[PDB]
Amino acid sequence: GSTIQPGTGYNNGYFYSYWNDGHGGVTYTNGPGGQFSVNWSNSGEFVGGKGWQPGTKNKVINFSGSYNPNGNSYLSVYGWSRNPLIEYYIVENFGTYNPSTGATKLGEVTSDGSVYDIYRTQRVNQPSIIGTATFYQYWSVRRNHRSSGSVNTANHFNAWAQQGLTLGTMDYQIVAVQGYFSSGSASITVS
């Protein structure tokens, strides 16, 4: 495949972020409107997708396309808040690994045609949007996996807050394919 250079910016009106760990084996392209594609084969770590900078706490995010992982990968609404620093995921599909494995369950929320299980995890002295830090991650993991739909983010953020999982001010908010040493392909359009 073809690829763009890792980085962030705007393409056809949408914020995008594409990051990888330099290992090789992943290509990411921006397409028309809210479209992006990812192809990977024996990758390292990467995250790529399109959306908004900053996100909001009441966005209804629409996504559609295909997602074909072979190994460890996620398809999510993905983003960060600052103050507090939080990395968050509304996981619509994944590959061989459910990212909530071993995590403490903090409740359930029903949204957009499925129940989601809610979890919190912690990253200790790990990279972040503000540098190396220790910070929480919040997860809503969809029970009914899919690669198209609509995500009413408020339903998740409100359920998280109810459970004591506070978000600060929103940084970027994208529909992202994340991979960890895996293979696959995906083609997703956001709006």
Curated annotation (Swiss-Prot):
The active site is at 87 (nucleophile), 178 (proton donor). It is an enzyme of class 3 (hydrolase). Its EC number is 3.2.1.8. Optimum pH is 4.5-5.5. Stable from pH 3.0 to 8.5 at room temperature and from pH 4.0 to 7.5 at 40 degrees Celsius. Substrate binds at residues 74, 78, 89, 123, 127, 137, 172. It is found in: Secreted. GO terms for molecular function: endo-1,4-beta-xylanase activity. GO terms for biological process: xylan catabolic process. Transmembrane segments: none annotated. The keyword DNA-binding does not apply. Keywords: Carbohydrate metabolism, Glycoprotein, Glycosidase, Hydrolase, Polysaccharide degradation, Pyrrolidone carboxylic acid, Secreted, Signal, Xylan degradation. It catalyses: Endohydrolysis of (1->4)-beta-D-xylosidic linkages in xylans. Induction: Induced by D-xylose, dependent on the cellulase and xylanase regulator xyr1. Repressed by glucose through negative regulation by the crabon catabolite repressor cre1. Residues 3-190 form the GH11 domain. Glycans are attached at residues 39, 62. GO terms for cellular component: extracellular region. Glycoside hydrolase involved in the hydrolysis of xylan, a major plant cell wall hemicellulose made up of 1,4-beta-linked D-xylopyranose residues. Catalyzes the endohydrolysis of the main-chain 1,4-beta-glycosidic bonds connecting the xylose subunits yielding various xylooligosaccharides and xylose. The catalysis proceeds by a double-displacement reaction mechanism with a putative covalent glycosyl-enzyme intermediate, with retention of the anomeric configuration. Produces xylobiose and xylose as the main degradation products. Belongs to the glycosyl hydrolase 11 (cellulase G) family. This is Endo-1,4-beta-xylanase 2. It comes from Hypocrea jecorina (strain ATCC 56765 / BCRC 32924 / NRRL 11460 / Rut C-30). The lineage of its organism: Eukaryota, Fungi, Dikarya, Ascomycota, Pezizomycotina.
